[PDB]
Amino acid sequence: LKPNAATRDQLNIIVSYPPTKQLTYEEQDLVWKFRYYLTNQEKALTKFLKCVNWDLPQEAKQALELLGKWKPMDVEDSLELLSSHYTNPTVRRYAVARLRQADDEDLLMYLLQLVQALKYENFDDIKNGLEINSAEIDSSQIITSPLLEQDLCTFLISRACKNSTLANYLYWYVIVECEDQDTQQRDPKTHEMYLNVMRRFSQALLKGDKSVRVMRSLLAAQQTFVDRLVHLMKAVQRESGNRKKKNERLQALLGDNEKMNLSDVELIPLPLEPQVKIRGIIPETATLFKSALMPAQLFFKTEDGGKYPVIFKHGDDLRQDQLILQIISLMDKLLRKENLDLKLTPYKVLATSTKHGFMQFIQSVPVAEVLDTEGSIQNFFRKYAPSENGPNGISAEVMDTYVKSCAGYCVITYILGVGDRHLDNLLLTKTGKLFHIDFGYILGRDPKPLPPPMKLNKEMVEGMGGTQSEQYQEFRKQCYTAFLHLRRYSNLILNLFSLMVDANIPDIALEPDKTVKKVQDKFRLDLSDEEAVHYMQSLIDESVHALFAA
Ligand SMILES: O=c1cc(N2CCOCC2)nc2n1CC[C@@H](C(F)(F)F)N2c1cc(F)cc(F)c1
């Protein structure tokens, strides 16, 4: 029952293994022998369930007995049991039981991955939860046409019926999976499941009280607003002529409220940010971007009489950008939790389908435009935010914001392996905030062969006041600090990426088995905290030396 000091130390090495590290048959036989001892440690549960052969009924039964007696696992470890690796229904009920203890704030951060976990859930239990050919059921028409106890589908709907923000995101995350043409063709049973999830969610909203019934009518109003906006986008993209002829069509159709109903609507929540209620799109200030993809810049009239600028794209998959931005939002929240605000810009991204979606426009000037107009980053900051007492004639608040945003994004783009990095993707604000846009290349993927691991640039270093400035010393300091805090939440970041292997993300579908390993290698879990600091310092030293030696 109780192992000796040598075996106790040997079991600790097995528990300390990174998520990718697979246990050998003799290694998992040792874990199985002392399964009753390991119940006192919550971190051992992940390693014990790796030993079990789920095709063997008694081995699965014995694991379930130990599962109930084991120390209550963390929310980050519960996400691993909802992945492709664990298809046993009882295991998934215990994973759902731990999410029930977690707050709605935490549940929102993993919601995109929780919708993806439905793929591994029991499809019959989902269908038999309702009180024809799958093509006959249009997902967009479900909400607009009204007539260890809980599983993942029952839990997500139950929590959504209580929280309006959670209901908003759960709706649009399921709608995208329904509209997924790849899932519709390669596995119709998965497509049918997502339709039943939507049909069950619509049914539970109608069954609910006055405030619950109001939620589905607002969701129907959001879908109708989106469907009309898509029809507007199609007509503008199909319009023969230049950008000016297309802009005139966009402004005229938006203004015609009797035909399109987009300029004047009742106070409805914005699908991108449900906390922000909208009056409609301003027709006179809506124009298309210079891009061939034809994205539209739309200004939304808020409840408070403000302006919410958005980038509504049509004919492009926002799914890859949606994941990266939700990970940046998680990483920012994790860094803020450890009392380190690196002034990051995790702009809201919401796909309304696999073909169309919204993007939160942040008032910023790209570094390419900054160089073409002002010459350098420092000249731009000295023009819009000057101070004589501050460093290099630039405001102390703005410079501090710049150093933190440069250090913050340097670590994040390194871990996420963000490729195709040029001055048009690097965006700068008048407040100091530096951020990355257009995440078309991630997890080592890059159009150029042999890309650098750290995406540092000569202009970023020049903006800090050189390599000898006290701002660059702060950059190095905030770089290893950000790396140390993110390494502490490595299990959380990797388990969410593990739940995204079957998601139709172009850069994940390329190498699904290697996805988790790609992120894990960047964290350098083989090295200690003190070693990780010097490795981060070595990455900066190498990148800086390679940059000037162009
Ligand atoms: O994915 C994104 C996100 C994004 N941002 C803007 C800042 O807030 C966050 C969202 N902007 C853009 N893109 C795609 C490429 C272009 C396009 F949309 F115009 F094509 N675009 C863009 C790029 C610029 F350099 C200047 C500009 F005004 C728009």
In 10 A of CB 173, how many CB atoms? 21
How many angstroms separate the alpha carbon of residue 437 from the centre of ligand 1?
6
- Give the span between the Cα atoms of 222 and 383, in whole angstroms: 42
Pairing of strands 365-366, 287-288: unpaired
**Which DSSP state fits 523?**
H
CB atoms closer than 10 angstroms to residue 383: 12
Ligand 1, atom 9: closest residue by C-alpha = 361
Are 474 and 382 contacting, i.e. CB atoms less than 8 angstroms apart?
Answer: no
Q: Which of 289, 291, 428, 439 to mutate to test the pocket of ligand 1 (most atoms within 8 A of CB)?
A: 289
The one-letter code for the residue type at 154 is T
**Residue 382: enclosing H or E segment and its boundaries?**
helix 377-384
DSSP 8-state class, residue 120: G
Q: Write down the CATH superfamily of domain 3-209.
A: Phosphatidylinositol 3-kinase, accessory domain (PIK) (1.25.40.70)
Sign for the CA dihedral angle at 186, 192, 198, 201 comes to: negative
Q: CA-to-CA distance for 13 and 529, rounded, in angstroms?
A: 17
CB-ligand 1 contact for 357 (6 Å cutoff): no
Contacts for 73 with CB less than 8 Å, ≥ 6 apart: 42, 45, 98
Are 519 and 416 spatial neighbours (Cβ–Cβ below 8 Å)? yes
Query: What is the CA(196)–ligand 1 centre distance, in A?
Result: 36
Q: CA–CA separation, 187 vs 155, rounded Å?
A: 24
Does residue 430 sit in helix, strand or coil? Answer: coil
CA pseudo-torsion sign 413, 417, 418, 420: positive
Q: Which of 367, 428, 437, 441 to mutate to test the pocket of ligand 1 (most atoms within 8 A of CB)?
A: 437
- Check: CB of residue 23 under 8 Å from CB of residue 51: yes
Contact 532, 481 (CB under 8 A): no
Q: What letter represents residue 182's amino acid? A: D
Beta-carbon contacts of 396 under 8 Å, excluding residues fewer than 6 positions away, are 387, 389, 390
Determine the distance separating the centroid of ligand 1 and the alpha carbon of 148, expressed in angstroms.
45
As a 3-state breakdown, the chain gives helix, strand, coil percent values, each rounded to 5, of 55, 10, 35
Query: What is d(CA 94, CA 72) in angstroms, rounded to the nearest whole number?
Result: 10
Dihedral of CA atoms 295, 496, 485, 547 in degrees, nearest 10, equals -50
- The residues near 151 (Cβ < 8 Å, ≥ 6 apart) are 89, 92, 93, 96, 121, 122, 125, 126
CATH 3.30.420.280 is held by the domain 364-550: no
Task: Say which residue the tokens 């195709």 belong to.
Answer: 420
Resolution for this model in angstroms, one decimal place? 3.0
Q: Is 364 in the pocket of ligand 1 (CB under 6 A)?
A: yes
Residue range(s) of every CATH 1.25.40.70 domain in the chain: 3-209
State the structure-solving technique.
X-ray
- Which tokens hold the place of 307? 């302006």
Q: Do 478 and 58 contact (CB within 8 A), yes or no?
A: no
Domain limits, CATH 1.10.1070.11, in the chain: 364-550
Domain 210-363 has CATH 3.30.1010.10: yes
Q: Which phi-psi region, left, alpha or beta, contains residue 443 (left: φ > 0; alpha: ψ -120 to 50)?
A: left
Q: How far away, in angstroms, is 293 Cα from ligand 1 center?
A: 12
Amino acid symbol at 18: P
